[PDB]
Amino acid sequence: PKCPECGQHLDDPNLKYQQHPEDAVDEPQMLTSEKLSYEDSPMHRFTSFSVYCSRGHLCPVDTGLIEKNVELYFSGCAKAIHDENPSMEGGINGKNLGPINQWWLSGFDGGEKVLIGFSTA
Amino acid sequence: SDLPEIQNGASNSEIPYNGEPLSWFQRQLRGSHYQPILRDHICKDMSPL
Numbered sequence: 001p002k003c004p005e006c007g008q009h010l011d012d013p014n015l016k017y018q019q020h021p022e023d024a025v026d027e028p029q030m031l032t033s034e035k036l037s038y039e040d041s042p043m044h045r046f047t048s049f050s051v052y053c054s055r056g057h058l059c060p061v062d063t064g065l066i067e068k069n070v071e072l073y074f075s076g077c078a079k080a081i082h083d084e085n086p087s088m089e090g091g092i093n094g095k096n097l098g099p100i101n102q103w104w105l106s107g108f109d110g111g112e113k114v115l116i117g118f119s120t121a
Numbered sequence: 122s123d124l125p126e127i128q129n130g131a132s133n134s135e136i137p138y139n140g141e142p143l144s145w146f147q148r149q150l151r152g153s154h155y156q157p158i159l160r161d162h163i164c165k166d167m168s169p170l
């Protein structure tokens with residue numbers, strides 16, 4: 001018993017399935033929210049996130065599944081770029097947020113600002 | 122008056138504030154915005170005596 005999308009085993013006892021929130025609107029819808037105020041791409045914070053395969057298995061990112069062409073989707077509470085708060089307070093909720101193009105990093109010079117960042121079309 | 126309770130010999134440098142600023146003065150040294158980490162709320166580990 002193996003996932004045909006992420007490969008994970010079904011008898012694997014750490015394995016978990018994704019649980020959406022209600023609000024959960026899909027990516028384009030949520031992006032048009034007033035809770036949000038040098039790129040031609042929006043740039044937001046994002047809390048309480050989960051990453052998963054089409055079949056709904058939580059998935060790591062570093063394992064190179066994106067690089068093996070596997071569509072991974074995500075969900076949580078998008079927040080305002082300036083918003084320091086990691087609670088779901090001033091945020092709108094998204095679901096199945098478009099397949100992950102790239103994932104990146106930054107913070108390798110100055111302070112301990114190692115920020116992990118997802119990229120979507 | 123706002124800073125969360127710690128105990129003798131506290132060593133965790135970065136910790137959550139766990140509460141809003143209470144006095145004027147506090148409001149001024151924390152900034153007119155949110156900041157999660159409270160840095161250097163650490164105190165000496167005094168002898169059991």
Ligand SMILES: [Zn+2]
Pocket residue numbers: 003004005006007008053054055056057
């Ligand atoms: Zn899967």
